[PDB]
Every structure is written in structure tokens, then in C-alpha cells.
Design a protein around this ligand. Sequence first.
Ligand SMILES: OC[C@H]1O[C@H](O[C@H]2O[C@H](CO)[C@@H](O)[C@H](O)[C@H]2O)[C@H](O)[C@@H](O)[C@@H]1O
Length: 394
Amino acid sequence: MIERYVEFVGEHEIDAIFKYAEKLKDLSILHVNSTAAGGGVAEILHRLVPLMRELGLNAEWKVIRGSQDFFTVTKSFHNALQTGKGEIPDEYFKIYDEWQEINAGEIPLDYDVVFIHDPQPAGLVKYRKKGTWIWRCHIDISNPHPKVWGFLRGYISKYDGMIVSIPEFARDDLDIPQIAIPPSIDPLSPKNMPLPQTTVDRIVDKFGVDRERPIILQVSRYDRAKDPVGVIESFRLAKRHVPDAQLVYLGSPEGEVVYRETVEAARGEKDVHLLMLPPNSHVEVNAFQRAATVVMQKSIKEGFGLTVSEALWKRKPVIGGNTGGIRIQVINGVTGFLVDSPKAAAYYLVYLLKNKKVREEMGEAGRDHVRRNFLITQQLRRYLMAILYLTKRH
Ligand SMILES: OC[C@H]1O[C@H](O[C@H]2O[C@H](CO)[C@@H](O)[C@H](O)[C@H]2O)[C@H](O)[C@@H](O)[C@@H]1O
């Protein structure tokens, strides 16, 4: 309910949202992504699509389907786009286009505005009617595999507009409008809502973690781009200087390979808790983020990382990988610290665990920074502004 957000962002931002919604209230809007049960894109749309409807926008949300072979091709496309590395069999491109065709037939695409989320459904623009097509990129495309990019740019160049999470992901090899809209957290979502101390305490104890002693938390998949092995290395280095400290890695199911290496890297320290929760364990993530003393998101590559703003909103200082969208959330020395190695991560863990007053000041700065920049009302407003801008130029 948009009324409830005045508490956080004030009345001017809400009036502005109603004003923009009035101008759009008889456009048909379709969002297309690749999972409804999944990660950050799903978490955003589950909150954002309902807010659009409540403003009287005709907004729908459809999910492409595929074989695991399709999702093997798109995972590798994802890693090649972010790392600039890999060998891509020519068969991958043929698998991709086939599942574009299959999905086009199963999805009505005749809307005034079509948002395509990330590379997986990007090839649906082949089957575009009229209307305004916007490619919403959530990942780091600053320095990609030239063959995968060259290919996807074949499709991207046919869109009317493009949204990236930070300006640094804008391509000078594209002439269509490129708009930087950071993602956001919904402060009223189960992930972010206040919890009674009782519920936090229950969930922490349930996983055998001691809330009498400091908790270092990373929330992330057991995936190379989140560097769980590096995170354990950071903790191992800090542990010598903060012996009572605990690490919680809060994961969600080649992924088993990384998890195994993570178990091996942890082989020795018994204050390491490598958890695996079902993906929709929102209240458990909430509870762990609230129980944390310091949060890490030590990513190698990261489009944005909602886990950062989630932690900052709960007044937790974040130690973040010095990459992509983490940099606009983690203001070095103010809301957290940016690090390029496990060694610097360890250095800043020890600093924060030993400097309570500085931790809490960072926590306050963190919440205020999210309040001004990364609440769902901010993303919703800029989203409505992009639609108005791009529809009026056809
Ligand atoms: O592209 C597939 C991945 O999409 C999600 O994450 C991306 O989008 C988030 C919201 O904009 C960003 O915070 C994040 O940095 C991006 O990688 C999803 O959460 C992942 O599980 C998928 O691999």
C-alpha cells in the first residue's frame, strides 16, 4: 500500500508516483523474466508488479520456461558476460534461439510496453509487434565475452530503450537510450519488515548459532561470483584477532562443487556455519541479517546485490567486493568498506568487530543511504519516468 511508504520517503515522492501513474493508466505493460521462485529479479517483481496494479496500471508478469540445457546455456552466457571469459559452442546460440521461438508462441507479446529482464528472454524481441520494448539488464556487462555480447547486442539494438543498474554498465557500442536505475528493497516485505527479538533469537538458535558472540554473515548462493571460499579465508584471517567471532554463510541451492570447496576451506574452524535454506526463506534471511554484527557481500562480479541494501537498512555495516553495483551502496568508510582481496576483508572485519561506536555510526549511515537511494518507491518512480520518457518518443 503506497500510503504506508510516506513514513520512509515523505509525501512528495508519493504524489510524484501518483502523478506519473495517471499519465500511464491506459498503457498495457508486460514484464518477462526467467523465474518466479528465484532470486533478486523475482523478489523485485513480486513487490513491484503489485504496486503498479494498485496505481491503476495494467501490468502483467510472465516467466519463460526451458530445459536444463537452455538454463546451462544462459548460466554460461551470464558468466561469460560478467567475466569476459569462456568457450561457447556454436550449438549454444542455436539452443537459445529455439527456446526464444518456443516461448514466443506460448506468450502473448502484444502490449504497449514490454520489459525483458536479463539475457535469457532477450531474443523475444525477434517476435516483437509494435509498442515500446525495454531491455532491463541486471548484470555486469561493462567488459563481456565479445562473441556472447556481439550475439546478444544483435537483439539489444532492436529494443527502444535499455535499463542498467549503474551508469558504468552503459555500452558506447549501443545508440538506443541507456537509463541507470538501481534496484531497491521493499522495507515492508517479509525479507525487510521489523521482527520481534523472540523470532530472531528462535531462528538463530535453530541453526545452532550462538547470539551471545559476534556473527559475520554473507547471504548468497554457493557460486564462484560470490567467492564463498574467499569469505571463509577472510574469516580464518580475522579469527586470529577476534577468536569469539562466528561465520554464517546463508546459501540456497557445479554449485555442489563450490559448496564442497567451501566445506574444505572451512575444515578446521567449527565457528563456521555453511547453511542451505529453501529459496523463499525470507523471514530466516531477515532474522540472520538482524542478528549479524557485520555483513559481507565479497562478490567478484555483482550487478547490484540486494543483500547489501538489505543489511544496510537493518543498520549492519557491509564489507563488499569492490565491483559493479556494490560500489554505489557501500560508501568506503561511511556505510561499509570496499575490498579487492580476502586479506583487506579480514583487515576490515577486525576493525569493525573492535570498534563498536564506529560499527553503529556506519549502521545509521547505511539505513539513511538506503532510505534516500534504494527503497522500492525510488525504483518505482524512476521506472514510471522511463516508461513516460520512452513511450512519448515511441
Ligand atoms: O541473471 C540471473 C541472476 O539474476 C539475479 O541477480 C541479478 O539481479 C539482481 C537484481 O537486480 C542483482 O542484485 C544481482 O547483482 C544480479 O546478478 C538473481 O538473483 C541470480 O540468482 C541470477 O543468477
